[PDB]
Amino acid sequence: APNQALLRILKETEFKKIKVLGSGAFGTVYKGLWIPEGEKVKIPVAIKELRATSPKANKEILDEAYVMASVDNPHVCRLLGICLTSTVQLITQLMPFGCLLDYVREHKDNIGSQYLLNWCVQIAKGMNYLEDRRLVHRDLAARNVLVKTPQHVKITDFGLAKLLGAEEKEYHAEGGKVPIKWMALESILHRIYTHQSDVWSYGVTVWELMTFGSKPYDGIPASEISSILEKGERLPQPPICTIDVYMIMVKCWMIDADSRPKFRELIIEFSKMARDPQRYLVIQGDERMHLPSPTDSNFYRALMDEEDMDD
Numbered sequence: 071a072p073n074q075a076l077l078r079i080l081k082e083t084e085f086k087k088i089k090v091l092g093s094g095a096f097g098t099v100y101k102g103l104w105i106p107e108g109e110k111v112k113i114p115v116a117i118k119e120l121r122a123t124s125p126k127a128n129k130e131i132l133d134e135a136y137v138m139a140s141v142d143n144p145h146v147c148r149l150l151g152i153c154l155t156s157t158v159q160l161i162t163q164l165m166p167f168g169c170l171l172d173y174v175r176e177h178k179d180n181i182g183s184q185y186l187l188n189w190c191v192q193i194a195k196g197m198n199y200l201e202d203r204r205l206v207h208r209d210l211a212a213r214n215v216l217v218k219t220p221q222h223v224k225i226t227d228f229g230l231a232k233l234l235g236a237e238e239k240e241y242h243a244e245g246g247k248v249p250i251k252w253m254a255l256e257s258i259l260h261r262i263y264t265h266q267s268d269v270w271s272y273g274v275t276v277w278e279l280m281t282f283g284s285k286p287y288d289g290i291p292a293s294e295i296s297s298i299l300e301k302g303e304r305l306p307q308p309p310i311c312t313i314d315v316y317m318i319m320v321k322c323w324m325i326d327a328d329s330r331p332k333f334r335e336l337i338i339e340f341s342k343m344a345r346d347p348q349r350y351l352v353i354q355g356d357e358r359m360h361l362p363s364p365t366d367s368n369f370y371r372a373l374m375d376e377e378d379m380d381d
């Protein structure tokens with residue numbers, strides 16, 4: 071299975087940085103516009119620039135560019151290209167509403183059952199596509215899901231994503247700092263990562279959204295978590311979730327990895343629930359909340375722009 075994905079190299083004069091969005095260990099990510107020459111289009115883009123220019127930091131962002139260029143799905147983040155300047159720049163589709171964790175935290179009074187179940191469906195679809203590509207995410211969380219519109223979310227952060235060939239089932243890592251509260255038990259004990267460990271992290275992500283962004287195992291540090299899950303203890307039932315949804319989470323948290331649901335079945339179940347949302351999620355004032363949408367907005371002369379329609 072040859073990977074005939076196309077790596078597009080961008081000129082720095084083809085995109086303009088508008089503002090800074092966030093800086094930290096990764097570098098600094100900018101909100102900007104990509105204007106391919108002569109095409110009369112603009113594309114809202116996120117530009118991650120990574121300064122020191124350490125060789126390992128380069129190697130890692132180019133690995134991320136590889137993985138992001140090898141995926142094409144409506145619920146997986148779009149890689150547009152990279153710029154090979156003094157500091158390597160990573161250009162992706164701009165997600166104007168940010169990460170889903172911050173979104174559910176700062177909009178919890180306006181989020182209904184329909185949006186929650188639809189987010190679960192879309193995330194399950196993106197993960198099922200990643201499983202189709204035999205790709206293991208290893209870092210699925212509400213922080214690693216970005217919001218294009220309140221009606222459309224996409225999986226992101228492929229820094230730990232690992233591809234497998236046709237016959238291979240597991241991934242073994244070593245000495246890498248890991249999000250322990252989202253990991254399956256077999257990944258904590260033996261550093262084994264499969265698509266079913268991604269299902270476990272999917273269950274933790276669903277629990278995150280149903281609790282409107284509460285941190286799992288809030289008071290407990292990492293050390294106890296392993297044995298705590300060996301005792302049979304799991305995350306509690308969120309107050310808004312019927313037993314139908316909490317059962318899905320619990321099945322995602324089974325010790326036997328083959329007993330957990332598959333992402334296609336999660337798509338099916340959350341689809342059934344999404345057609346009658348308030349039968350499965352009880353939210354006070356659910357019945358008329360409004361979440362925003364684009365109003366042809368932002369700062370200047372945006373008469374010729376789009377993003378998921380540039381092919």
Ligand SMILES: CCC(=O)Nc1cc(Nc2nccc(-c3cn(C)c4ccccc34)n2)c(OC)cc1N(C)CCN(C)C
Pocket residue numbers: 091092093099101116162163164165166167168169172173176216
């Ligand atoms: C992480 C917090 C966040 O999401 N910031 C954010 C991001 C985007 N857009 C976007 N698109 C693609 C990638 C990224 C991105 C990828 N990485 C790895 C990042 C790291 C830091 C910051 C952004 C990114 N960000 C946005 O749209 C204009 C607005 C915001 N805010 C101002 C927040 C709003 N505040 C109320 C919550």
